Write a protein that binds this ligand. Structure first.
Ligand code: HEM
Ligand code: HEM
Ligand SMILES: Cc1cc(N)nc2cc(-c3cccc(CN)c3)ccc12
Ligand SMILES: Cc1cc(N)nc2cc(-c3cccc(CN)c3)ccc12
Ligand SMILES: C[C@H](O)[C@H](O)[C@H]1CNc2nc(N)[nH]c(=O)c2N1
Ligand SMILES: C[C@H](O)[C@H](O)[C@H]1CNc2nc(N)[nH]c(=O)c2N1
Ligand SMILES: [Zn+2]
Lengths: 421, 419
């Protein structure tokens, strides 16, 4: 409970003072005697589907958000503010829920991004195209909204960050869900001999898709179909029009052989399995997209052992000594791979940001947030890039982590909870 | 209050922590705010003003004695009872107490064991403990330190060691090694605003000069020892040069690399921390191991506020340094770390690469969970400063918590000492 918490940057000596943490809403997982800062999903970053808020629970949550909204537009205590409070309250009282105004929906989505501790790209938070899909009733409808989102966001390579928001949760038996973890991801296939074709991360969902009727090409980079659930009904399959899926073949500025590896990736990162919470309301289907930081593809997607795992093959074509770890052959290959990814995206004029630029922008964003907001919650474990950590400025930047609402939350995979019709 | 699980997202192995239930010190976090990236929260530090009392001391003493006799399977033995008795009579009549030699060794090993930020802990029980609690003067300190340095260097076959000087009494009679490490390079603020040598040590260097040290004013001048005994003014000593093992850094492919004139010392020996055991505080306890290559190759050489050599190397590598997206820094960084490892190895000086070390640490965790019910570990420090996610610790969930005996931070003595 101290009113002021300070963070230091150990490279610049800049010290920042945080007061925003006083507005913190939920638990982190940590206590006085233990820190869970490297735990990926503590119980508080998640949202179980059947605990739907009671009337009594929802009132103060809505009011909290409404007050925050009118505060932001400098109309706090105003007649419109008081009238909105009364309306929401009356609405909660007679329907056990309430509907957000368009302005509020837009404000809440933007602030869930602004509040996202683990996102290094938040300097962009105020530029977010919000698509209101709350009139959607069927999975065909969801498919139509998602196609339009993908096309708008892709913009022929000049990517624009966007979110599409489907109807909020009601009784929890009528959820809208995108079963895909991202709108665009490649299939993975377990072979009888134990090997994996395509993306090992997506094996389970790929199998579900095939069970649901999807005919798989069974290649290395097969774009998965959308698996879409409207109003708690069984999910349904749709092929994304291929012309809407922008891809980049990976080549290297110096190594002519690099193109022979046959690698490519998609331009549009679009996470679709998270939950958006605004004023106690739960939007279980809210796909959002931006553009890539190169390391997300070049370090994690490609060089993770449980992913495409290409380090060995790259090192071999580089004719490195792969006998001792102390030769840093993995490190050497890792850099070249990330060079190729950045180079291939820029060459095709597809928006991408390197981890040096992104982290420097983030430090500037953080400083501005401390100034204009009283703080900026940040998760160092996620903010620091997966390669070259200490030669980026976020490595030396102390951060405070805490949960502000509106927020994006994890939710359980829908196939674990769905009551099949 | 529960059994907590940690998952490794690469191997899917799940460990169960019960050891955290034993912890007594605070971490810095609360239920609503995580401070896992704060370098020195109020709880990892030890101010000399905060000296114990009879009232505070015995419970801490009993706690440690109890854990010691449990570790040697003699909890509640006649020896255990008598020891508790002995320690209380002693705190009564002296306001403190002295550790048995067995206790001191046990205490130092476990301080290392419990160091949540140290990736080298698989080695924790291989520690040479030098008891210097009979020391009374800075000359005595220097002698002990020379012996430490000589033993631990061992002609390049490095051996872990710690030397323990007398414990804090009233706080006016502290023993302190003013150096941050036993062996470090000097830094000099140049007239033209820049820094010659190591910028990390500019302040300490100035104090050495102010105290009479005659600086060679080079890029790698070994600093003098500056030694404080029993609260007296610190005294300067030159470590005999034949005791200081150094490695010239060269590259296995780049013949021009040796021409950069880089070198480093072989023995990492941190001397500015505080060892706490059974409520007693050891303000001077230099301890040494061997290097993980990134400590030198990534942080020492490439931190902006350190030797800052990336530009030079990339220049010699003829890389395109106009766009960050060419990853020219990342390239130069890998090469420097290749050189460092290759140089130490060629000179048969003990060193470990970050792949090997993170690998050993994961095995260590598994060992500790099995035999101890957990291992406190600080992901922020454990993950190496380069190539993080291609080392196994990146994907290892870790719980951080504070066990005692511990190593703690303490304020630099020049911020307190009255001359
Ligand atoms: C505009 C360019 C953007 C960039 C460069 C960017 C960058 C990143 C990166 C690199 C990560 C870590 C990814 C990983 O390790 O898997 C991340 C996480 C995240 N991003 Fe951003 N992002 C961008 C846009 C957005 C947008 C538009 C939103 C939402 C409206 C968003 C919300 C999030 C969230 C909620 C997380 C972490 C989720 C969690 O695990 O808690 N980002 N971002
Ligand atoms: C034997 C080989 C050892 C290796 C390879 C090793 C490795 C490391 C590394 C890489 C760090 C991080 C340093 C930094 O980032 O600046 C570290 C920190 C640390 N080491 Fe070890 N170490 C070793 C031995 C020891 C010994 C012998 C002790 C004490 C008896 C020790 C106690 C500590 C402590 C207390 C810290 C962090 C202090 C803090 O900030 O809380 N280590 N070690
Ligand atoms: C919008 C956006 C842009 C971008 N460049 N990266 C993103 C990464 C995530 C993300 C969050 C949690 C887990 C994972 C694992 N795949 C990814 C979410 C949104 C992102
Ligand atoms: C024994 C040993 C071996 C080794 N290889 N590294 C070490 C690093 C530290 C350390 C602790 C806190 C801050 C810093 C800042 N440079 C360094 C302590 C002991 C070490
Ligand atoms: C701000 C941050 O806590 C600080 O830069 C830390 C991060 N992780 C580190 N990790 C190690 N091993 N050593 C360090 O000095 C640091 N510094
Ligand atoms: C165990 C650890 O928390 C886990 O591997 C985290 C570490 N940091 C990360 N950081 C980012 N940006 N993305 C990740 O997926 C992870 N994974
Ligand atoms: Zn924490």
């Amino acid at each position: 409970c101290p009113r002021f918490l300070k963070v230091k940057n150990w490279e610049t000596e800049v010290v920042l003072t945080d007061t925003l943490h006083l507005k913190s809403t939920l638990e982190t997982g940590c206590t006085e005697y233990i820190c869970m800062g490297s735990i990926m999903h503590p119980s508080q970053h998640a949202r179980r589907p059947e605990d739907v808020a009671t009337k009594d629970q929802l009132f103060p949550l809505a009011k909290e958000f409404i007050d925050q909204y009118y505060s932001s537009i400098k109309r706090f205590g105003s007649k419109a503010h008081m009238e909105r409070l009364e309306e929401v309250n009356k609405e909660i009282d007679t329907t056990s829920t309430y509907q957000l105004k368009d302005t509020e929906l837009i404000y809440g989505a933007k602030h869930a991004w602004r509040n996202a501790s683990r996102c290094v790209g938040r300097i962009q938070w105020s530029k977010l195209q919000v698509f209101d899909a709350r009139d959607c009733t069927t999975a065909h409808g969801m498919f139509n909204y998602i196609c339009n989102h993908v096309k708008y966001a892709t913009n022929k390579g000049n990517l624009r960050s966007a979110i599409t928001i489907f109807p909020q949760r009601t009784d929890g038996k009528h959820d809208f869900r995108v079963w895909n973890s991202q709108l665009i991801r490649y299939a993975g296939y377990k072979q009888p001999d134990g090997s994996t074709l395509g993306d090992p991360a997506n094996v389970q969902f790929t199998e579900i898709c095939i069970q649901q009727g999807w005919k798989p090409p069974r290649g290395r980079f097969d774009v998965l179909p959308l698996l879409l659930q409207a109003n708690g009904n069984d999910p349904e399959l749709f092929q994304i029009p291929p012309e809407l899926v922008l891809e980049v073949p990976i080549r290297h500025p110096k190594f002519e052989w690099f193109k022979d590896l046959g690698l490519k990736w998609y331009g549009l990162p679009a996470v679709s399995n998270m939950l958006l919470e605004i004023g106690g309301l739960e939007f279980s289907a809210c796909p959002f997209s931006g553009w890539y930081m190169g390391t997300e593809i070049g370090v994690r997607d490609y060089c993770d052992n449980s992913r495409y795992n290409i380090l060995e093959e790259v090192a071999k074509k580089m004719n490195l000594d792969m006998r001792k770890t102390s030769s840093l052959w993995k490190d050497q290959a890792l850099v070249e791979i990330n060079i190729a990814v950045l180079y291939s995206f820029q060459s095709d004029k597809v928006t991408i940001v390197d981890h040096h630029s992104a982290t420097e922008s983030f430090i500037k964003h953080m400083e501005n947030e401390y100034r204009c907001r009283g703080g900026c919650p940040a998760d160092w474990v996620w903010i620091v890039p997966p390669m070259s950590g200490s030669i980026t400025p976020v490595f030396h930047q102390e951060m405070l982590n805490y949960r502000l609402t509106p927020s994006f939350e994890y939710q359980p995979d829908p196939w674990n909870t769905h009551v099949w019709k």
